[PDB]
Symmetry: C3
């Protein structure tokens, strides 16, 4: 099965039980923030309310997909309120939009809006020209494995780099 | 009001009275050459004949626009006689042609014909690819403020960088 | 007269009599391998069988064109069996396919498949963007005269660089 959830499970990873992030709060699933901070009881309370069952604090893969899919909806909402990202997002097909959401989850919207020239080439359907330009970035140098997969997605509009 | 005259008033500047240029003759308006050289009476004579009124040597903004618009017509005529520039100029819309005329006023037609790769991308309607390539030039490094505005014009075909 | 034979006669050269190549066997025409190796009688035997007349070992220009045209057919067959090259080759017009065959004769299919980004831009009909990218290669630095002609062919789809 290949979709946005599986895409981020590969790029970011899955955590089926509560953990702490890099400075520094309680998290679950694919980067789902629960509370800030530092009592585990408050985070365990936020968990049960969010899923709608008994847990302390362990979930399933289907439950984690439910949390992640709500984050994507909130992310899409964010992108649509941003004048710098809305025209790109609008012009793209569903799979190329997943590559743009993947980037937003990694660096935030201010970071993604920084990819102006490449985002504009994508808008013009210059897939290959944008692929070449995206690979000449600091993002590509620092996380090349993730960046190569995201670039293939923007280039093809298929899930090929994740299969 | 936004047009080619206002565009060059911003990039090059307006002189409502006679002056001397960088080596070295009598000039008025947006770089309008009067005579070479060095008597101010000959230049003042050329002025009155060109406008069709009394002046020694001071003009209005509307009079300066008349002189400038004649230079653009002569510039367009020059571009059309050039095999290297005519195909680009022909393919462009009115606002993108103003960006190309702006470049010709800054560096001359031999200088602009030197932008071969970028001019060809413009011909293919590869706006964004040409914007990126134009920014990687010595012209961009030496006059970045003017170059950024001209590049936005080539990219959009709107007057946005001048409003 | 301008076609693929004349194109390679310019880029690689014509040999109307048997010779030895750079390590190291008997060759004729535009790089046509006869046998490996090292008896000239075996090569002279292979020659007569291939052309269908008396020779030891000297041919005409029309006979050399016959040998070369068989190599192009074998080259096209090779490209079509390659998943990395078949989609590009299919999308191109006859003259742009001749530029791609020229590259295959110079560096082989593994070498040409290495031009991924540029081949993809050609597929998208981004002629000018691919021309710029192809010129930024080691191939261009090592053989610029040949590379410039091949790049003009990919850019225009005309024989202009060879006329
Ligand atoms: Cl492209
Ligand atoms: Cl573009
Ligand atoms: Cl192009
Ligand atoms: Cl490009
Ligand atoms: Mg989506
Ligand atoms: Mg990585
Ligand atoms: Mg105009
Ligand atoms: Mg400046
Ligand atoms: Mg052919
Ligand atoms: Mg050479
Ligand atoms: Zn392109
Ligand atoms: Zn483009
Ligand atoms: Zn292009
Ligand atoms: Zn491009």
């Amino acid at each position: 099965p290949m979709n946005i959830f599986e895409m981020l499970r590969i790029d970011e990873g899955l955590r089926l039980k509560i953990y702490k992030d890099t400075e520094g709060y309680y998290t679950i699933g694919i980067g789902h923030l629960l509370t800030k901070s530092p009592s585990l009881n408050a985070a365990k309370s936020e968990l049960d309310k969010a899923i709608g069952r008994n847990t302390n604090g362990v979930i399933t893969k289907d439950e984690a997909e439910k949390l992640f899919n709500q984050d994507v909806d909130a992310a899409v909402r964010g992108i649509l309120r941003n004048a710098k990202l809305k025209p790109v997002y609008d012009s793209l097909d569903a799979v190329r939009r997943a590559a743009l959401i993947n980037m937003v989850f990694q660096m935030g919207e201010t970071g993604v809006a920084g990819f102006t020239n490449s985002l504009r080439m994508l808008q013009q359907k210059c897939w290959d020209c944008a692929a070449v330009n995206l690979a000449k970035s600091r993002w590509y140098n620092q996380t090349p494995n993730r960046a190569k997969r995201v670039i293939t997605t923007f280039r093809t509009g298929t899930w090929d780099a994740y299969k």
